[PDB]
mmCIF file of all heavy atoms in Angstrom:
data_model
loop_
_atom_site.group_PDB
_atom_site.id
_atom_site.type_symbol
_atom_site.label_atom_id
_atom_site.label_comp_id
_atom_site.label_asym_id
_atom_site.label_seq_id
_atom_site.Cartn_x
_atom_site.Cartn_y
_atom_site.Cartn_z
ATOM 1 N N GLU A 1 -9.920 -40.857 48.609
ATOM 2 C CA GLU A 1 -9.846 -39.412 48.770
ATOM 3 C C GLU A 1 -8.443 -38.895 48.564
ATOM 4 O O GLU A 1 -8.267 -37.753 48.140
ATOM 5 C CB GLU A 1 -10.341 -39.004 50.153
ATOM 6 C CG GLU A 1 -10.368 -37.513 50.386
ATOM 7 C CD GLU A 1 -10.910 -37.154 51.752
ATOM 8 O OE1 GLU A 1 -11.227 -38.081 52.526
ATOM 9 O OE2 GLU A 1 -11.009 -35.947 52.053
ATOM 10 N N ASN A 2 -7.447 -39.709 48.833
ATOM 11 C CA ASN A 2 -6.078 -39.350 48.547
ATOM 12 C C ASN A 2 -5.556 -40.252 47.448
ATOM 13 O O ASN A 2 -4.415 -40.706 47.469
ATOM 14 C CB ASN A 2 -5.226 -39.432 49.805
ATOM 15 C CG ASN A 2 -5.548 -38.343 50.766
ATOM 16 O OD1 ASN A 2 -6.069 -37.306 50.370
ATOM 17 N ND2 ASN A 2 -5.241 -38.555 52.035
ATOM 18 N N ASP A 3 -6.415 -40.518 46.474
ATOM 19 C CA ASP A 3 -5.984 -41.106 45.221
ATOM 20 C C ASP A 3 -6.772 -40.472 44.090
ATOM 21 O O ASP A 3 -7.647 -39.632 44.304
ATOM 22 C CB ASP A 3 -6.165 -42.615 45.197
ATOM 23 C CG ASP A 3 -5.692 -43.217 43.901
ATOM 24 O OD1 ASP A 3 -4.477 -43.138 43.640
ATOM 25 O OD2 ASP A 3 -6.527 -43.751 43.141
ATOM 26 N N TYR A 4 -6.462 -40.895 42.884
ATOM 27 C CA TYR A 4 -7.100 -40.405 41.681
ATOM 28 C C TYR A 4 -8.005 -41.490 41.121
ATOM 29 O O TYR A 4 -7.629 -42.664 41.076
ATOM 30 C CB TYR A 4 -6.049 -40.032 40.653
ATOM 31 C CG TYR A 4 -5.283 -41.244 40.269
ATOM 32 C CD1 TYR A 4 -5.703 -42.043 39.234
ATOM 33 C CD2 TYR A 4 -4.104 -41.562 40.909
ATOM 34 C CE1 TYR A 4 -4.985 -43.141 38.855
ATOM 35 C CE2 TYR A 4 -3.379 -42.653 40.542
ATOM 36 C CZ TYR A 4 -3.823 -43.444 39.513
ATOM 37 O OH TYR A 4 -3.095 -44.550 39.143
ATOM 38 N N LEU A 5 -9.203 -41.096 40.712
ATOM 39 C CA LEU A 5 -10.157 -41.989 40.072
ATOM 40 C C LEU A 5 -10.408 -41.476 38.668
ATOM 41 O O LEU A 5 -10.729 -40.301 38.483
ATOM 42 C CB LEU A 5 -11.462 -42.063 40.859
ATOM 43 C CG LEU A 5 -12.505 -43.073 40.393
ATOM 44 C CD1 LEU A 5 -13.321 -43.539 41.580
ATOM 45 C CD2 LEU A 5 -13.422 -42.481 39.336
ATOM 46 N N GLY A 6 -10.257 -42.352 37.680
ATOM 47 C CA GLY A 6 -10.381 -41.952 36.297
ATOM 48 C C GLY A 6 -9.140 -42.309 35.503
ATOM 49 O O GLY A 6 -8.512 -43.345 35.727
ATOM 50 N N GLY A 7 -8.794 -41.432 34.572
ATOM 51 C CA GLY A 7 -7.714 -41.692 33.634
ATOM 52 C C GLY A 7 -6.467 -40.884 33.943
ATOM 53 O O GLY A 7 -6.541 -39.675 34.161
ATOM 54 N N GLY A 8 -5.327 -41.569 33.953
ATOM 55 C CA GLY A 8 -4.042 -40.900 33.961
ATOM 56 C C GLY A 8 -3.816 -39.958 35.117
ATOM 57 O O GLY A 8 -3.194 -38.907 34.932
ATOM 58 N N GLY A 9 -4.274 -40.309 36.316
ATOM 59 C CA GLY A 9 -4.265 -39.329 37.383
ATOM 60 C C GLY A 9 -2.904 -38.740 37.653
ATOM 61 O O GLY A 9 -2.814 -37.604 38.118
ATOM 62 N N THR A 10 -1.841 -39.460 37.307
ATOM 63 C CA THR A 10 -0.501 -39.009 37.633
ATOM 64 C C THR A 10 -0.171 -37.698 36.958
ATOM 65 O O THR A 10 0.745 -36.994 37.389
ATOM 66 C CB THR A 10 0.516 -40.067 37.232
ATOM 67 O OG1 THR A 10 0.094 -41.338 37.738
ATOM 68 C CG2 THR A 10 1.871 -39.737 37.813
ATOM 69 N N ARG A 11 -0.900 -37.345 35.916
ATOM 70 C CA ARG A 11 -0.846 -35.992 35.411
ATOM 71 C C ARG A 11 -1.862 -35.119 36.111
ATOM 72 O O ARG A 11 -2.212 -34.050 35.603
ATOM 73 C CB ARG A 11 -1.039 -35.970 33.898
ATOM 74 C CG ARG A 11 0.272 -36.175 33.139
ATOM 75 C CD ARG A 11 0.013 -36.590 31.717
ATOM 76 N NE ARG A 11 -1.035 -37.596 31.673
ATOM 77 C CZ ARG A 11 -0.837 -38.888 31.890
ATOM 78 N NH1 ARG A 11 0.378 -39.340 32.156
ATOM 79 N NH2 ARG A 11 -1.858 -39.728 31.834
ATOM 80 N N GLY A 12 -2.359 -35.566 37.254
ATOM 81 C CA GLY A 12 -2.924 -34.629 38.187
ATOM 82 C C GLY A 12 -4.402 -34.467 37.992
ATOM 83 O O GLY A 12 -4.946 -33.377 38.189
ATOM 84 N N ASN A 13 -5.071 -35.532 37.590
ATOM 85 C CA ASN A 13 -6.488 -35.402 37.320
ATOM 86 C C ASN A 13 -7.211 -36.564 37.960
ATOM 87 O O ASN A 13 -6.862 -37.719 37.716
ATOM 88 C CB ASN A 13 -6.743 -35.380 35.823
ATOM 89 C CG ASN A 13 -6.335 -36.645 35.184
ATOM 90 O OD1 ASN A 13 -5.644 -37.454 35.799
ATOM 91 N ND2 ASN A 13 -6.740 -36.845 33.946
ATOM 92 N N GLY A 14 -8.220 -36.253 38.758
ATOM 93 C CA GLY A 14 -9.087 -37.280 39.282
ATOM 94 C C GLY A 14 -9.351 -37.160 40.763
ATOM 95 O O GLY A 14 -10.176 -37.899 41.303
ATOM 96 N N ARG A 15 -8.673 -36.239 41.433
ATOM 97 C CA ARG A 15 -8.856 -36.115 42.867
ATOM 98 C C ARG A 15 -10.305 -35.806 43.170
ATOM 99 O O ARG A 15 -10.913 -34.938 42.544
ATOM 100 C CB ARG A 15 -7.965 -35.022 43.439
ATOM 101 C CG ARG A 15 -6.477 -35.308 43.388
ATOM 102 C CD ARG A 15 -5.702 -34.237 44.145
ATOM 103 N NE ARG A 15 -6.213 -34.057 45.501
ATOM 104 C CZ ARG A 15 -5.900 -34.839 46.529
ATOM 105 N NH1 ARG A 15 -5.066 -35.855 46.354
ATOM 106 N NH2 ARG A 15 -6.412 -34.604 47.729
ATOM 107 N N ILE A 16 -10.855 -36.531 44.135
ATOM 108 C CA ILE A 16 -12.255 -36.420 44.503
ATOM 109 C C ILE A 16 -12.376 -36.467 46.015
ATOM 110 O O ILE A 16 -11.422 -36.776 46.729
ATOM 111 C CB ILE A 16 -13.103 -37.542 43.904
ATOM 112 C CG1 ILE A 16 -12.590 -38.880 44.415
ATOM 113 C CG2 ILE A 16 -13.067 -37.493 42.410
ATOM 114 C CD1 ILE A 16 -13.367 -40.063 43.894
ATOM 115 N N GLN A 17 -13.575 -36.150 46.500
ATOM 116 C CA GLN A 17 -13.905 -36.292 47.909
ATOM 117 C C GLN A 17 -15.328 -36.796 48.058
ATOM 118 O O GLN A 17 -16.144 -36.718 47.134
ATOM 119 C CB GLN A 17 -13.759 -34.980 48.663
ATOM 120 C CG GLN A 17 -12.370 -34.671 49.073
ATOM 121 C CD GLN A 17 -12.288 -33.322 49.717
ATOM 122 O OE1 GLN A 17 -13.250 -32.559 49.691
ATOM 123 N NE2 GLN A 17 -11.141 -33.010 50.304
ATOM 124 N N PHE A 18 -15.630 -37.248 49.269
ATOM 125 C CA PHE A 18 -16.944 -37.752 49.632
ATOM 126 C C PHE A 18 -17.563 -36.825 50.663
ATOM 127 O O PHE A 18 -16.903 -36.441 51.630
ATOM 128 C CB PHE A 18 -16.849 -39.168 50.196
ATOM 129 C CG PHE A 18 -15.981 -39.276 51.411
ATOM 130 C CD1 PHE A 18 -16.504 -39.077 52.670
ATOM 131 C CD2 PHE A 18 -14.646 -39.595 51.295
ATOM 132 C CE1 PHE A 18 -15.708 -39.175 53.783
ATOM 133 C CE2 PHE A 18 -13.850 -39.698 52.406
ATOM 134 C CZ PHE A 18 -14.380 -39.488 53.649
ATOM 135 N N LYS A 19 -18.818 -36.454 50.449
ATOM 136 C CA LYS A 19 -19.534 -35.639 51.415
ATOM 137 C C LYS A 19 -20.947 -36.156 51.611
ATOM 138 O O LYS A 19 -21.494 -36.870 50.768
ATOM 139 C CB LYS A 19 -19.627 -34.179 50.998
ATOM 140 C CG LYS A 19 -18.324 -33.489 50.774
ATOM 141 C CD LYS A 19 -18.563 -32.008 50.568
ATOM 142 C CE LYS A 19 -19.734 -31.765 49.635
ATOM 143 N NZ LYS A 19 -19.563 -32.476 48.344
ATOM 144 N N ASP A 20 -21.535 -35.754 52.734
ATOM 145 C CA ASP A 20 -22.941 -35.985 53.030
ATOM 146 C C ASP A 20 -23.255 -37.473 53.015
ATOM 147 O O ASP A 20 -24.224 -37.934 52.418
ATOM 148 C CB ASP A 20 -23.840 -35.229 52.053
ATOM 149 C CG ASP A 20 -23.636 -33.736 52.113
ATOM 150 O OD1 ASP A 20 -23.088 -33.249 53.125
ATOM 151 O OD2 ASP A 20 -24.022 -33.045 51.152
ATOM 152 N N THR A 21 -22.418 -38.219 53.709
ATOM 153 C CA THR A 21 -22.631 -39.646 53.821
ATOM 154 C C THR A 21 -23.869 -39.903 54.659
ATOM 155 O O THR A 21 -24.047 -39.307 55.723
ATOM 156 C CB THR A 21 -21.418 -40.312 54.452
ATOM 157 O OG1 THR A 21 -21.194 -39.744 55.747
ATOM 158 C CG2 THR A 21 -20.193 -40.079 53.593
ATOM 159 N N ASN A 22 -24.731 -40.776 54.170
ATOM 160 C CA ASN A 22 -25.891 -41.224 54.916
ATOM 161 C C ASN A 22 -25.971 -42.736 54.809
ATOM 162 O O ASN A 22 -25.612 -43.314 53.782
ATOM 163 C CB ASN A 22 -27.158 -40.579 54.400
ATOM 164 C CG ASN A 22 -27.243 -39.120 54.736
ATOM 165 O OD1 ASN A 22 -27.529 -38.745 55.876
ATOM 166 N ND2 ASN A 22 -26.995 -38.276 53.748
ATOM 167 N N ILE A 23 -26.429 -43.376 55.874
ATOM 168 C CA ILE A 23 -26.593 -44.820 55.893
ATOM 169 C C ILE A 23 -28.030 -45.116 56.260
ATOM 170 O O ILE A 23 -28.508 -44.663 57.304
ATOM 171 C CB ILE A 23 -25.653 -45.491 56.897
ATOM 172 C CG1 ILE A 23 -24.219 -45.040 56.652
ATOM 173 C CG2 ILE A 23 -25.778 -46.988 56.785
ATOM 174 C CD1 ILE A 23 -23.679 -45.467 55.317
ATOM 175 N N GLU A 24 -28.721 -45.863 55.413
ATOM 176 C CA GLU A 24 -30.042 -46.349 55.761
ATOM 177 C C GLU A 24 -30.184 -47.806 55.365
ATOM 178 O O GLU A 24 -29.533 -48.284 54.432
ATOM 179 C CB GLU A 24 -31.142 -45.541 55.098
ATOM 180 C CG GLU A 24 -31.342 -44.174 55.698
ATOM 181 C CD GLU A 24 -32.667 -43.568 55.304
ATOM 182 O OE1 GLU A 24 -33.594 -44.341 54.983
ATOM 183 O OE2 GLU A 24 -32.783 -42.325 55.309
ATOM 184 N N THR A 25 -31.046 -48.503 56.087
ATOM 185 C CA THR A 25 -31.424 -49.870 55.769
ATOM 186 C C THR A 25 -32.746 -49.810 55.021
ATOM 187 O O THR A 25 -33.799 -49.610 55.628
ATOM 188 C CB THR A 25 -31.539 -50.695 57.037
ATOM 189 O OG1 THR A 25 -32.624 -50.195 57.821
ATOM 190 C CG2 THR A 25 -30.265 -50.576 57.837
ATOM 191 N N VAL A 26 -32.692 -49.967 53.697
ATOM 192 C CA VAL A 26 -33.911 -49.868 52.901
ATOM 193 C C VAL A 26 -34.843 -51.023 53.206
ATOM 194 O O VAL A 26 -36.055 -50.840 53.350
ATOM 195 C CB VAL A 26 -33.576 -49.817 51.405
ATOM 196 C CG1 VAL A 26 -34.840 -49.839 50.587
ATOM 197 C CG2 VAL A 26 -32.757 -48.579 51.096
ATOM 198 N N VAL A 27 -34.302 -52.230 53.301
ATOM 199 C CA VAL A 27 -35.096 -53.428 53.499
ATOM 200 C C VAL A 27 -34.466 -54.212 54.628
ATOM 201 O O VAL A 27 -33.298 -54.603 54.536
ATOM 202 C CB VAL A 27 -35.170 -54.294 52.234
ATOM 203 C CG1 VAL A 27 -35.886 -53.544 51.123
ATOM 204 C CG2 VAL A 27 -33.782 -54.728 51.794
ATOM 205 N N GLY A 28 -35.224 -54.440 55.684
ATOM 206 C CA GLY A 28 -34.793 -55.366 56.699
ATOM 207 C C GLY A 28 -34.968 -54.784 58.075
ATOM 208 O O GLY A 28 -35.642 -53.773 58.267
ATOM 209 N N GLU A 29 -34.327 -55.439 59.031
ATOM 210 C CA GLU A 29 -34.454 -55.114 60.437
ATOM 211 C C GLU A 29 -33.084 -54.992 61.053
ATOM 212 O O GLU A 29 -32.800 -55.531 62.124
ATOM 213 C CB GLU A 29 -35.275 -56.171 61.167
ATOM 214 C CG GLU A 29 -36.678 -56.378 60.621
ATOM 215 C CD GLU A 29 -37.638 -55.283 61.041
ATOM 216 O OE1 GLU A 29 -37.311 -54.533 61.986
ATOM 217 O OE2 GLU A 29 -38.721 -55.173 60.428
ATOM 218 N N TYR A 30 -32.200 -54.278 60.374
ATOM 219 C CA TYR A 30 -30.851 -54.094 60.867
ATOM 220 C C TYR A 30 -30.639 -52.644 61.270
ATOM 221 O O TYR A 30 -31.173 -51.726 60.643
ATOM 222 C CB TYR A 30 -29.823 -54.496 59.826
ATOM 223 C CG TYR A 30 -28.518 -54.805 60.477
ATOM 224 C CD1 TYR A 30 -28.263 -56.070 60.974
ATOM 225 C CD2 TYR A 30 -27.559 -53.827 60.647
ATOM 226 C CE1 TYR A 30 -27.076 -56.362 61.595
ATOM 227 C CE2 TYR A 30 -26.367 -54.106 61.269
ATOM 228 C CZ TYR A 30 -26.131 -55.378 61.741
ATOM 229 O OH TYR A 30 -24.947 -55.671 62.370
ATOM 230 N N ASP A 31 -29.863 -52.442 62.328
ATOM 231 C CA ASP A 31 -29.603 -51.098 62.815
ATOM 232 C C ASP A 31 -28.282 -50.589 62.269
ATOM 233 O O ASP A 31 -27.266 -51.282 62.325
ATOM 234 C CB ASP A 31 -29.591 -51.056 64.339
ATOM 235 C CG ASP A 31 -30.976 -51.224 64.931
ATOM 236 O OD1 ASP A 31 -31.963 -50.987 64.204
ATOM 237 O OD2 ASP A 31 -31.079 -51.592 66.121
ATOM 238 N N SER A 32 -28.306 -49.372 61.742
ATOM 239 C CA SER A 32 -27.125 -48.794 61.123
ATOM 240 C C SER A 32 -26.802 -47.419 61.681
ATOM 241 O O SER A 32 -26.411 -46.519 60.936
ATOM 242 C CB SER A 32 -27.325 -48.713 59.617
ATOM 243 O OG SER A 32 -28.486 -47.961 59.317
ATOM 244 N N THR A 33 -26.936 -47.248 62.988
ATOM 245 C CA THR A 33 -26.727 -45.954 63.623
ATOM 246 C C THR A 33 -25.346 -45.813 64.227
ATOM 247 O O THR A 33 -24.710 -44.772 64.078
ATOM 248 C CB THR A 33 -27.777 -45.737 64.715
ATOM 249 O OG1 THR A 33 -27.713 -46.821 65.648
ATOM 250 C CG2 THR A 33 -29.170 -45.693 64.108
ATOM 251 N N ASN A 34 -24.860 -46.856 64.886
ATOM 252 C CA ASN A 34 -23.479 -46.883 65.317
ATOM 253 C C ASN A 34 -22.543 -47.105 64.150
ATOM 254 O O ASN A 34 -21.322 -47.043 64.322
ATOM 255 C CB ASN A 34 -23.283 -47.980 66.352
ATOM 256 C CG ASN A 34 -23.933 -47.643 67.668
ATOM 257 O OD1 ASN A 34 -24.162 -46.475 67.975
ATOM 258 N ND2 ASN A 34 -24.253 -48.665 68.448
#
């Protein structure tokens, strides 16, 4: 989030953020709530 992803970020391109994170266990019996 405080780096650049992509090409040549040092010219100021690539800043991104993450939103709406969700965690689920598609297959199995593991708890992912904490």
Side-chain angles (χ1 to χ4, degrees):
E1 183 178 2
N2 289 337
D3 181 65
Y4 63 89
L5 186 150
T10 311
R11 274 162 316 278
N13 63 347
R15 293 187 53 81
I16 60 179
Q17 278 176 350
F18 59 88
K19 302 188 316 305
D20 299 341
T21 59
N22 289 284
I23 308 296
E24 287 197 25
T25 66
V26 175
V27 296
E29 302 283 344
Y30 202 86
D31 288 340
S32 57
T33 56
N34 289 337

